[PDB]
Amino acid sequence: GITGTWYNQLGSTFIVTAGADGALTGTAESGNAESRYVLTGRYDSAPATDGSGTALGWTVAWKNNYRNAHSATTWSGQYVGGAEARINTQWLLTSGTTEANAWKSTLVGHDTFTKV
Amino acid sequence: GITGTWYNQLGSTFIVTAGADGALTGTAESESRYVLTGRYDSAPATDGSGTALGWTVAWKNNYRNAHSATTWSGQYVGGAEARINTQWLLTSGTTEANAWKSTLVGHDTFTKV
Amino acid sequence: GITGTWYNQLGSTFIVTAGADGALTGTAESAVGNAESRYVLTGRYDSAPATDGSGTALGWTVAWKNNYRNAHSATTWSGQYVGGAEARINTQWLLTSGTTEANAWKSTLVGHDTFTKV
Amino acid sequence: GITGTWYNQLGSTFIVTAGADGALTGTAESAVGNAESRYVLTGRYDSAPATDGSGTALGWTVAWKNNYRNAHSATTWSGQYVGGAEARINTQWLLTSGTTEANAWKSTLVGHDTFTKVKP
Numbered sequence: 001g002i003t004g005t006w007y008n009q010l011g012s013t014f015i016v017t018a019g020a021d022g023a024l025t026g027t028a029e030s031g032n033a034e035s036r037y038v039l040t041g042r043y044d045s046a047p048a049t050d051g052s053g054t055a056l057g058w059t060v061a062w063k064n065n066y067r068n069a070h071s072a073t074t075w076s077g078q079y080v081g082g083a084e085a086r087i088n089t090q091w092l093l094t095s096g097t098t099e100a101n102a103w104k105s106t107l108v109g110h111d112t113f114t115k116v
Numbered sequence: 117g118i119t120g121t122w123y124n125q126l127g128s129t130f131i132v133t134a135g136a137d138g139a140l141t142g143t144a145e146s147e148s149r150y151v152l153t154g155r156y157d158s159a160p161a162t163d164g165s166g167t168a169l170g171w172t173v174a175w176k177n178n179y180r181n182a183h184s185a186t187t188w189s190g191q192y193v194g195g196a197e198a199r200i201n202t203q204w205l206l207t208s209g210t211t212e213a214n215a216w217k218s219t220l221v222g223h224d225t226f227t228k229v
Numbered sequence: 230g231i232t233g234t235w236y237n238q239l240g241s242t243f244i245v246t247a248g249a250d251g252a253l254t255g256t257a258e259s260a261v262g263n264a265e266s267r268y269v270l271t272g273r274y275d276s277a278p279a280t281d282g283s284g285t286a287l288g289w290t291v292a293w294k295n296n297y298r299n300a301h302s303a304t305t306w307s308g309q310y311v312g313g314a315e316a317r318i319n320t321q322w323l324l325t326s327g328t329t330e331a332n333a334w335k336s337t338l339v340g341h342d343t344f345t346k347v
Numbered sequence: 348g349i350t351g352t353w354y355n356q357l358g359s360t361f362i363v364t365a366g367a368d369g370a371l372t373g374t375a376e377s378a379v380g381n382a383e384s385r386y387v388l389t390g391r392y393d394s395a396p397a398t399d400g401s402g403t404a405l406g407w408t409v410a411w412k413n414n415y416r417n418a419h420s421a422t423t424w425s426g427q428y429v430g431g432a433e434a435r436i437n438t439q440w441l442l443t444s445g446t447t448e449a450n451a452w453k454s455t456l457v458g459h460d461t462f463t464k465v466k467p
Binding site for chain 1: 455
Binding site: 080092 | 138151152153154155156157160161165166170172174175181184185187188190191193203206208211215218
């Protein structure tokens with residue numbers, strides 16, 4: 001269920017593969033190789049059967065062969081296989097700063113992913 | 117720089133390998149050991165900025181499973197008292213109507229001790 | 230545009246008054262309107278926002294104690310007001326519970342709420 | 348106990364008064380960002396905290412507008428007061444700036460502040 005192509009609410013494209021031992025691997029993009037970055041993470045490979053969703057998280061560092069923004073985003077959330085399968089997340093984006101600007105280093109937000 | 121053993125505020129031990137390709141792999145040890153994986157900026161600036169990174173632990177191994185995952189977002193700061201400063205989000209699997217309460221937030225500081 | 234009754238995705242009802250000197254005061258209550266479910270809110274907002282189409286920054290707090298009950302916690306909402314025909318307040322919130330020192334690492338929840346006029 | 352002058356790790360000064368009704372009122376002077384002079388602070392606290400050694404839940408907001416400057420943003424602090432020899436308030440915060448819609452995704456910063464009654 002988690003394996004596939006997912007889209008967030010602003011239209012970015014996340015191609016994710018879920019491995020048997022809890023690994024998440026894939027890529028995050030915009031439609032150019034210049035805008036493609038590697039993602040990696042983990043998920044709960046044996047969730048509960050009570051109806052709960054499946055907890056997961058992943059990271060993207062915003063460095064590829066073409067560009068480097070000196071930043072990384074982590075998404076923390078859960079997959080729900082409902083009428084529409086979705087992944088609901090909260091994220092944190094941290095930019096490299098000097099320690100004097102460290103208090104403003106980190107943004108927070110939320111993203112919903114769908115296969116549509 | 118990043119590769120090695122790191123200790124957080126509450127005596128947990130993280131052993132991390134920083135790959136040349138930007139990969140972070142390792143373990144988090146608090147039966148208590150779990151895989152971590154993540155990414156870091158493998159070509160950071162040299163203007164005194166720290167190096168941006170993130171990683172994820174899903175809290176399942178061969179013995180236990182808390183149906184949760186934690187992601188840490190932060191940066192490595194090199195030097196005399198090297199540290200990794202982070203913020204984290206812990207998400208637990210909930211049902212639909214408990215989802216408002218699925219996510220904790222906090223912060224952690226890692227040192228080489 | 231902020232003064233009025235706002236409803237979040239949970240159905241809860243927030244009655245907010247925005248005063249001329251950036252004060253926000255009001256109540257949070259259940260759909261059902263009973264006294265037991267009513268709590269005080271206080272916060273602040275940008276009383277002279279940009280004219281560029283930007284929204285209006287604001288925040289407020291609710292401690293979940295009233296004369297009837299006490300959950301020993303507080304929620305803060307940080308967000309901005311977007312006006313128009315589909316005025317909304319977009320927020321992220323932190324909820325903190327009183328905890329012993331041992332449990333402080335798990336004292337604070339985070340999430341997001343969107344408020345509408347309808 | 349909560350009433351007093353508090354300082355965070357960055358030297359900012361917060362002068363808070365806890366009312367018997369659960370109200371928090373006061374002033375903030377920040378050492379960082381787009382600011383100068385004092386700004387109004389308002390919030391709420393649990394005026395009847397548990398008795399089991401748990402902290403006192405609280406929160407407040409500052410909108411960063413005064414007669415001198417306006418940064419079009421507001422910060423909320425959420426946390427708890429821990430009484431004692433060295434009393435302290437441990438918080439997490441959210442800072443939201445007014446943006447347009449297309450920029451809304453990068454509108455909110457998140458952090459943590461620790462306050463003491465003794466200035467660093």
